[PDB]
Amino acid sequence: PSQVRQNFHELCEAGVNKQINLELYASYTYHSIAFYFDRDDVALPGAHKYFKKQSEEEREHAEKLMKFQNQRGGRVKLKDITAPEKEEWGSLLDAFKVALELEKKVNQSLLDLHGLADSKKDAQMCDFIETHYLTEQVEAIKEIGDHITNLKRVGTGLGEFIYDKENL
Amino acid sequence: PSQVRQNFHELCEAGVNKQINLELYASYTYHSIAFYFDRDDVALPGAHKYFKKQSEEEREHAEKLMKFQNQRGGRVKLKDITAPEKEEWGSLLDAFKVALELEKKVNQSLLDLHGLADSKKDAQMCDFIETHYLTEQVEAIKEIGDHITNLKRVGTGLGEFIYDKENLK
Amino acid sequence: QPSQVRQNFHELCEAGVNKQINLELYASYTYHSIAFYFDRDDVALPGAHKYFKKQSEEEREHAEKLMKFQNQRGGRVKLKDITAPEKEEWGSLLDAFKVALELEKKVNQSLLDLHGLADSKKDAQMCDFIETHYLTEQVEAIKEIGDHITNLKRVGTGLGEFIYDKENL
Amino acid sequence: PSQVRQNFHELCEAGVNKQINLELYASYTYHSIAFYFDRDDVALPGAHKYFKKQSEEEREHAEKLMKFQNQRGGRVKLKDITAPEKEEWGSLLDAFKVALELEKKVNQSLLDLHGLADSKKDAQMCDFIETHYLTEQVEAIKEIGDHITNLKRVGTGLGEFIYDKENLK
Amino acid sequence: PSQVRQNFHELCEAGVNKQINLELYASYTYHSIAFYFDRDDVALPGAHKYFKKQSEEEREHAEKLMKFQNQRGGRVKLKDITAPEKEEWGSLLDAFKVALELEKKVNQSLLDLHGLADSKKDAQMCDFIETHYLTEQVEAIKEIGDHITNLKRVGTGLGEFIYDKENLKED
Amino acid sequence: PSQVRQNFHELCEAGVNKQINLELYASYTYHSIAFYFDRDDVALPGAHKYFKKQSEEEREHAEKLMKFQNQRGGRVKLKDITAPEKEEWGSLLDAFKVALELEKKVNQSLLDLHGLADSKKDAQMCDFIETHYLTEQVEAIKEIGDHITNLKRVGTGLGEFIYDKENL
Ligand SMILES: [Mg+2]
Ligand SMILES: [Mg+2]
Ligand SMILES: [Mg+2]
Ligand SMILES: [Mg+2]
Ligand SMILES: [Mg+2]
Ligand SMILES: [Mg+2]
Ligand SMILES: [Mg+2]
Ligand SMILES: [Mg+2]
Ligand SMILES: [Mg+2]
């Protein structure tokens, strides 16, 4: 056992390792969407920059968790990062619709992980997930909700280009 | 009778407390409108910022009447603030139409208050109403009128998003 | 149909938020009242006037923050009338700060009741939100008041109330 | 009971008073280590500066708890601060081995104190420990484990001198 | 067929997508090495900073080929990103040995991809790999070569600490 | 042993260690008086700040004697830091009355140590405590003297509050 390890269940160590995969998976999906909007047949430069930053924030959510593993004295176990479920993401609206599902999936995965923290009475692991993840997820989902509502209000023609140029 | 009271009738004093309530009611209604546009299924952040400023300005309107009351020797009496008329405020144009009837409602209240002050030969209350409320209210009604005219020019859909970003931010 | 953002947010919790925003605004309304009582010519404590105005506004932002929370999680903001304050005449500075200790303890307990509901329905984020923005700010507000109450007891009734107002408010 | 006391069990107060002593014992222990490295036969100036700072950072932890005791309306009870368990601390590696055993004892005291807090539905007190202590202890234990790993790597003689100059100042 | 596409063979398009995967594999491997050094039993914060950096440069190598794939009107195609060969990377010298082998592997695929571009008379694709990839990889291999020679010269204990603080925690 | 040791008596080492405990004792006592003024039913924030400043200055008095012990080549020996004599320190005037007596006890202790150093012809040790301790103690006792006088002058109620703002 690590010299720093105290109050850190091997089941919670496994839990964290499953999260860093989900986040890296999320990161990799935003990256696909990012470079899909750089396509000459799509040409939406604001979505390219927005989803590239969304991808970089998840490599960070993963790093922070990788950081948390070493802090608590766990051992980081990587698995393959699965390819995104799509190659063509359709409209700007379709892309945010995929974003909302991805974020809900990740939120739940953290809510279950937090569940597993409370269960084995890991007050610090809980704080860590409350403080860096749970409110940042709620913020992220509202933002995506707002984007969906505004992409529906704008049409699919002129409004898409304007929303791309102004709100991303 | 307050040591400061001079040429300040008790129906006028009653009249100021009725106005104070109308300002808090308007504030509350604009508070409602401001947070309806923060909803994920509405999401007009311009309208959010705008109606929040309008609510803070009606509280300042109430506060100046609260202050005025104390200046004249009167005594501030607070009633309940009635909840806004609706939960769901509809489109941007629907929200600004409510705002117009509201401001005409409080404008009419102020003009009646002026009339009362004037029948009781209270010059300084007339000046106070003239100076801080009546021109404020005409400007505020002309502003709302323009927003309505513009919200009808721009359509629903894209029109609502452009006007939100360009004219409320 | 639920809001497209709504996840892990029980309707008891939603209904909970809506109840706390009213209490927040009830408390804002009461502090406003204490505010302008100190602005009266026959009370004339301009420190206390400033202190309570600032207090009224902070609670409007506490409700304003809970309206943001409501919309973030997919809940729907529902306003009731804001009850009028319990008193017109708030007495001495010490009396006013005693009403503030009663009021902040009701509001703290209302939040601690709301957290427990949060915890009941395994709503981790709502618990963090009430812990982060409300529970520590309440404990700081109540201690400040106790200190004020103590210090208002230590100084006299007369000269002492003037100095405390000038100096600590 | 203090005029500010609300949802603060007298076992949570007793618990808070046990932790101020543990922080002061750790503070005192780091103070001995500090001045052991200032001895002409140890002469390690980085460790001296480091462990003085570690001692100063406790006492602040003791103070933040004495501070919270008063916030909640509890009553600070000061027991003897027990002498360090040694005069002679040995190597720089030997000192960080003691720090690791000390910080875990401290951590386990804080986790125990949190569970007692959770047991008596003291949401704010849990939030206090979570915010100010639980994360701090973890960062602190990781830092001490890194130090231990690093002083085994360079190992005795020049490696001790360099680790003192480069990684402690 | 893409409105911009001109003088871009479907096997070349196929080759670019194979490099983006190798570059994302390298980024992931350097990502794993990075956090190994942040373990409390490895505690080498210089190597952690340094491999953290080398990993982000590989996601940038991938992004430039993604960016290029789009410019030529080819379509980006994402395979799974294979988990790294190990969790126990060993010594600072061991990690730099795994890096000289990972970097000679990427360079050879890059040299084959250029060969293919030349084969298909794609001057621009060739120039593009010459400009952003070929001398960067040579520069990257020379730098790792020097690290290995230096990790060899310094000790296993104290030498590993100094070299971390001096040549990697700075850089 | 000690390669730096010269003209330093084993009773002088012992006296220094005895003085370090007295200074840490005073620090603890000022500490208690600190947070006693931080109570919601006492609430004198001036006194709180003043006594926190005095607790730190004594730990400093302790640290400088620890520093002196090592300079002369003696060995620091720590004992338990005795807990304060009271929990409830009463009035602002009560707390300064306690300060004076603590300061005089600590001063007489220094004057005994100086005497002991003089008896052993430790010229540097006498100057050390003359330079950093004996005059500082006289300045501290007289400051407390002024405080006691002024607290009697201001009296019990308002004057407590006014002296706490204006003069601490
Ligand atoms: Mg994420
Ligand atoms: Mg108005
Ligand atoms: Mg005029
Ligand atoms: Mg509040
Ligand atoms: Mg501590
Ligand atoms: Mg918590
Ligand atoms: Mg590369
Ligand atoms: Mg002293
Ligand atoms: Mg002399």
Author numbering:
A (entry chain A), F (entry chain H): 3 to 170
B (entry chain E), D (entry chain G): 3 to 171
C (entry chain F): 2 to 170
E (entry chain B): 3 to 173
Please give the exact wording used by the authors of the publication that reports this structure.
Ferritin is considered to be an ubiquitous and conserved iron‐binding protein that plays a crucial role in iron storage, detoxification, and immune response. Although ferritin is of critical importance for almost all kingdoms of life, there is a lack of knowledge about its role in the marine invertebrate sea cucumber (Apostichopus japonicus).
In this study, we characterized the first crystal structure of A. japonicus ferritin (AjFER) at 2.75 Å resolution. The structure of AjFER shows a 4‐3‐2 symmetry cage‐like hollow shell composed of 24 subunits, mostly similar to the structural characteristics of other known ferritin species, including the conserved ferroxidase center and 3‐fold channel. The 3‐fold channel consisting of three 3‐fold negative amino acid rings suggests a potential pathway in which metal ions can be first captured by Asp120 from the outside environment, attracted by His116 and Cys128 when entering the channel, and then transferred by Glu138 from the 3‐fold channel to the ferroxidase site. Overall, the presented crystal structure of AjFER may provide insights into the potential mechanism of the metal transport pathway for related marine invertebrate ferritins.
